Amino acid sequence: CSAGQISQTTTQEPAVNGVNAQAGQVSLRNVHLRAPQQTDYVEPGTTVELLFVAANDSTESNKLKSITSDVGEVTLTGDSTVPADGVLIVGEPDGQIQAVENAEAADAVTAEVELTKPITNGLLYDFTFTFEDGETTVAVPISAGEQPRRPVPPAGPG
């Protein structure tokens, strides 16, 4: 009965850096922050982009995507009402393919945040995604898609 109602395979979160929030009619998937940090923290005043895919669960729609702002002054450049039984892809997660060189509606609703607060990858940061149907807190992480290891200074024995 390892394949009973409590099976390991069915209850498996995707092996992705982003977090998934199911609260509300719209479901949030692959929620994370692209924020290349060159030091201990990401200093306030630097724009870091917020990636997520919003899926409208019901076909009857919560396409509003009102504010989705938190501490950091979230800004939705190229805002649009994308969700209609379809993905709302705010940005371009590392590895995302631009299907065509031309972009419809300019940037596909790219979300950016001015930190106003130090952040370092490996932490949980709350972002209150507000939709017309409801609002949800996500505790967004920081994700680095494919940027290889930055060369650490070689150690001098002492």
Binding site: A3, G4, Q5, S7
Partner: protein, 50 residues
């Protein structure tokens, strides 16, 4: 087990695959592992006498 699950529209205690394994192994046990052997059980029992 299958019948207790089937008395209710919901899945009270059997997962879909658990119930499927249940009817599979039940049919196989009761055809190929109870009946086709017990015919030969009765054979060995009485046919040499008969």
């Amino acid at each position: 087990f299958m019948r207790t699950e089937l008395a209710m529209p919901g899945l009270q205690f059997l997962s879909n695959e658990q119930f499927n394994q249940l009817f599979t192994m039940h049919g196989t046990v009761m055809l190929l592992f109870y009946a086709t052997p017990i015919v030969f059980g009765f054979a060995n029992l009485v046919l040499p006498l008969q």
